[PDB]
Amino acid sequence: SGFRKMAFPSGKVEGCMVQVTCGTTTLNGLWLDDVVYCPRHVICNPNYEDLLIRKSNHNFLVQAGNVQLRVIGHSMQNCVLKLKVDTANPKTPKYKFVRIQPGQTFSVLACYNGSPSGVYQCAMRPNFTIKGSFLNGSCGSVGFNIDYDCVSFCYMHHMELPTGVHAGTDLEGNFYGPFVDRQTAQAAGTDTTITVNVLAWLYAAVINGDRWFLNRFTTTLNDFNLVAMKYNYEPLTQDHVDILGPLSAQTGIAVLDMCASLKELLQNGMNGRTILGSALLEDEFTPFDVVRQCSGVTF
Amino acid sequence: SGFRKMAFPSGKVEGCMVQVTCGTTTLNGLWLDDVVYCPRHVICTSEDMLNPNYEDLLIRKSNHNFLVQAGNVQLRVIGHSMQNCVLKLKVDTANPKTPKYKFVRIQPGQTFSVLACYNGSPSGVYQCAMRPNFTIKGSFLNGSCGSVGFNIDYDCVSFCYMHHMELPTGVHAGTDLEGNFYGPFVDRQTAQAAGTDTTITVNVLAWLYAAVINGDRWFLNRFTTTLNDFNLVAMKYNYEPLTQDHVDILGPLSAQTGIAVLDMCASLKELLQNGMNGRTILGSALLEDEFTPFDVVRQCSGVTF
Ligand SMILES: O=C(Cc1cccc(Cl)c1)Nc1cncc2cc(OCCN3CCCC3)ccc12
Numbered sequence: 293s294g295f296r297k298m299a300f301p302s303g304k305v306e307g308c309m310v311q312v313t314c315g316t317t318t319l320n321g322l323w324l325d326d327v328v329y330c331p332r333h334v335i336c337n338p339n340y341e342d343l344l345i346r347k348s349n350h351n352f353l354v355q356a357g358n359v360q361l362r363v364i365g366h367s368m369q370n371c372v373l374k375l376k377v378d379t380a381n382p383k384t385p386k387y388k389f390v391r392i393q394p395g396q397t398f399s400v401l402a403c404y405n406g407s408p409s410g411v412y413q414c415a416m417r418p419n420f421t422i423k424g425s426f427l428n429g430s431c432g433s434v435g436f437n438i439d440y441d442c443v444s445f446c447y448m449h450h451m452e453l454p455t456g457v458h459a460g461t462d463l464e465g466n467f468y469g470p471f472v473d474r475q476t477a478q479a480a481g482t483d484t485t486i487t488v489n490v491l492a493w494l495y496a497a498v499i500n501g502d503r504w505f506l507n508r509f510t511t512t513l514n515d516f517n518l519v520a521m522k523y524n525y526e527p528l529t530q531d532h533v534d535i536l537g538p539l540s541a542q543t544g545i546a547v548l549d550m551c552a553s554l555k556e557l558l559q560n561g562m563n564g565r566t567i568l569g570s571a572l573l574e575d576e577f578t579p580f581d582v583v584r585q586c587s588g589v590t591f
Numbered sequence: 592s593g594f595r596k597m598a599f600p601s602g603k604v605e606g607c608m609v610q611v612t613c614g615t616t617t618l619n620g621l622w623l624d625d626v627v628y629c630p631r632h633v634i635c636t637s638e639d640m641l642n643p644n645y646e647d648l649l650i651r652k653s654n655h656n657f658l659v660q661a662g663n664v665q666l667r668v669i670g671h672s673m674q675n676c677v678l679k680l681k682v683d684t685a686n687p688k689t690p691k692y693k694f695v696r697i698q699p700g701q702t703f704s705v706l707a708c709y710n711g712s713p714s715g716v717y718q719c720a721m722r723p724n725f726t727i728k729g730s731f732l733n734g735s736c737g738s739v740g741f742n743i744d745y746d747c748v749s750f751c752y753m754h755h756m757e758l759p760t761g762v763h764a765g766t767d768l769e770g771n772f773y774g775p776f777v778d779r780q781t782a783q784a785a786g787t788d789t790t791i792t793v794n795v796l797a798w799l800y801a802a803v804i805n806g807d808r809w810f811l812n813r814f815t816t817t818l819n820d821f822n823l824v825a826m827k828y829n830y831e832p833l834t835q836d837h838v839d840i841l842g843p844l845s846a847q848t849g850i851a852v853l854d855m856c857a858s859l860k861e862l863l864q865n866g867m868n869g870r871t872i873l874g875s876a877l878l879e880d881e882f883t884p885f886d887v888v889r890q891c892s893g894v895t896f
Pocket residue numbers: 293632640731732733734735736755756757763777778779780
């Protein structure tokens with residue numbers, strides 16, 4: 293019993309965190325094999341190719357714990373700077389660089405000065421921002437998922453938007469969303485609720501004994517999305533319906549049956565009642581997260 | 592900017608997790624130096640659970656009855672002793688990954704990170720608080736017994752909790768790392784129930800100061816209150832009494848935001864009187880009590896927005 297927001301064990305990632313310094317800018321780097329990946333704005337009309345051509349390998353001070361790492365080359369890939377170093381990290385895990393879609397969740401290891409300070413779980417929002425907990429110096433903190441024994445790096449933190457939300461890239465330097473890495477006016481679009489995730493969390497509530505929101509009713513996929521579109525909810529596709537299959541099978545509540553409960557939960561509200569200790573409908577637990585936390589999968 | 596429930600990086604703790612097996616019972620152990628700590632109910636059959644004599648059950652066991660597994664390597668047990676509700680298995684090898692550690696016992700309201708393990712294998716990490724009724728609201732299944740709660744201040748890991756059982760209401764109970772239970776619980780299958788739970792008041796006030804630091808001020812009011820008048824209203828909403836120590840502890844946050852502790856208490860009384868009214872504080876529609884005054888100061892800084 294119990295449903296908590298749970299992150300992946302951060303150990304395999306901690307052994308990769310280093311501190312990258314260029315001039316006055318100091319942020320975090322990800323040391324995998326003989327390369328250190330970090331946001332390219334560490335070298336900061338910012339023409340990054342023009343700013344990088346003027347730098348030498350000794351300008352980058354990379355520090356792994358209390359040991360300095362020797363930079364022997366550097367290249368830029370989109371918005372990420374790759375610093376080729378002298379030593380290959382002995383603690384390099386089995387890893388993969390993956391790009392995630394909105395709605396997908398991941399673990400963030402928040403770092404300051406190459407030293408891990410906290411770990412938390414979050415979701416890639418439909419408007420491509422993340423609602424993280426970041427301060428100055430957290431740039432270069434990474435988002436990951438653990439796949440059996442292989443770490444999947446999916447996010448690298450770059451900046452904070454005027455609304456307190458965060459923006460970053462995948463590990464190939466490609467931004468998530470319509471953002472650019474510079475001091476300019478940038479705004480996160482209107483956010484929507486991740487529908488498939490709220491439904492997964494309602495199945496998790498049923499599994500944990502919370503059944504008050506259930507009803508005898510059902511709906512069509514078209515009638516649900518017409519109401520969802522009105523409440524700023526992401527459209528529920530047939531793929532989403534299919535993905536919720538195992539939870540539907542385990543609880544005996546058909547997906548469109550659970551959609552009628554969400555429909556009533558949107559028009560009539562919580563009414564002083566809570567679902568899993570929450571007075572709001574939670575959207576940062578995917579259907580897979582619910583299965584993993586309510587089955588005991590380990591790494 | 593941004594306020595999240597944050598756990599400590601679990602790495603230093605992961606390198607300590609092992610699987611302890613005695614007969615058919617299989618749970619987790621904490622391997623520090625040449626000793627493996629685990630709940631003493633690993634020697635119990637699910638039968639003896641009602642009224643077991645652990646001294647009598649341990650005297651009948653030998654070192655080869657305990658199968659300790661660190662990864663894919665078996666650890667050889669060369670001695671064993673019991674300290675309250677924890678079993679200490681002396682082993683042949685000292686853990687090379689042993690961190691700088693300390694066993695600490697915490698008070699209700701205190702927060703810590705939990706590394707949930709199954710079969711000596713870490714599966715997840717989450718942050719929680721020791722409830723006023725001494726239970727924890729964790730996310731645990733069968734086999735999670737022996738999972739540990741910790742705080743990593745500076746480079747030292749402070750072990751403060753070891754999971755033992757789940758109560759009828761879904762809440763969890765356990766001991767400090769010296770085998771002493773938190774609360775009036777016993778490691779027996781007798782009828783036990785968690786008392787009435789109360790809200791950790793000093794933590795809600797800390798979280799309201801964190802909200803002010805993150806820009807949200809809508810809940811603030813022009814009123815102040817006495818400590819006695821606040822507690823009379825707090826009691827009525829099932830809130831823990833706010834002591835003068837709590838008032839003192841909230842001093843730095845009071846200084847940083849410019850809102851006196853008793854002024855924030857009036858804003859809190861008004862929230863309990865009126866509700867949230869469709870508004871949210873730090874992305875929450877409920878008043879959050881699992882962030883201590885020390886967590887807020889740690890996660891936030893010294894510049895208010
Ligand atoms: O409690 C024990 C063993 C035990 C028993 C008695 C005394 C001691 Cl000292 C130790 N281990 C568990 C720990 N944490 C969480 C659990 C969750 C569990 O199952 C969720 C669903 N429950 C199915 C039965 C009602 C609901 C089962 C077991 C859990």
